[PDB]
Amino acid sequence: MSEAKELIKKMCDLQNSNEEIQKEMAGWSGVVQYKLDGEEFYVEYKSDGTCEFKEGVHSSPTFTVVAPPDFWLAVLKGQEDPVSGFMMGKYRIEGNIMEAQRLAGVIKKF
Amino acid sequence: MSEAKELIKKMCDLQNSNEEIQKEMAGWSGVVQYKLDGEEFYVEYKSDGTCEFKEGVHSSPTFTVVAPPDFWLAVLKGQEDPVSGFMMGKYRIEGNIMEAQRLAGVIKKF
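^ inputs. structure came back:
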């Protein structure tokens, strides 16, 4: 495993055993697909704040993070920022269903 | 104004005068740009659950909804669904900063 992948897996383990992280994560559901120099893995995020780390490619992810592994590691360690990094084009993102879901939620309320 | 645009403006007015809608909307911040057959307008969503409807094009929207106006009207009235509609390609969405923001939020917690 790349260091980034190893660390994502570690974060999932911490999340799944830590009630406080789960509370903070609760309320959102999605699958985040990673592709780091062709290394494929994903994290299923459940509304109860738990998650599942899986190998390979999920059939319909919420979005895919296509990032060089050394950059993503730096991000995971807080040496780079996903937002400014994205604004600079230091990685890319595929998929817009999350925006569709947001629009649906807003309109639902009226 | 298209009927869809008129209705979005009405929804913003209701949101801004209705404490309950504001409570339900609170906690998220973004600008949603609309482009409906070239008709341009946007809604600024603030974390306190209020909003601002504006004419024209905002310089850096969270995302842009590029939709035919009659379809979007049908969506706003609940005759079509933004999620299934998006899955079918009945409209499109430009921008992924919201995903970058989501990634940042998850990583922040570790």
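Chain A is about 45% helix and 25% strand. The domain at 1-110 of chain A is CATH 3.30.1050.10 (Nonspecific Lipid-transfer Protein; Chain A).
thumbs up if we can close this ticket
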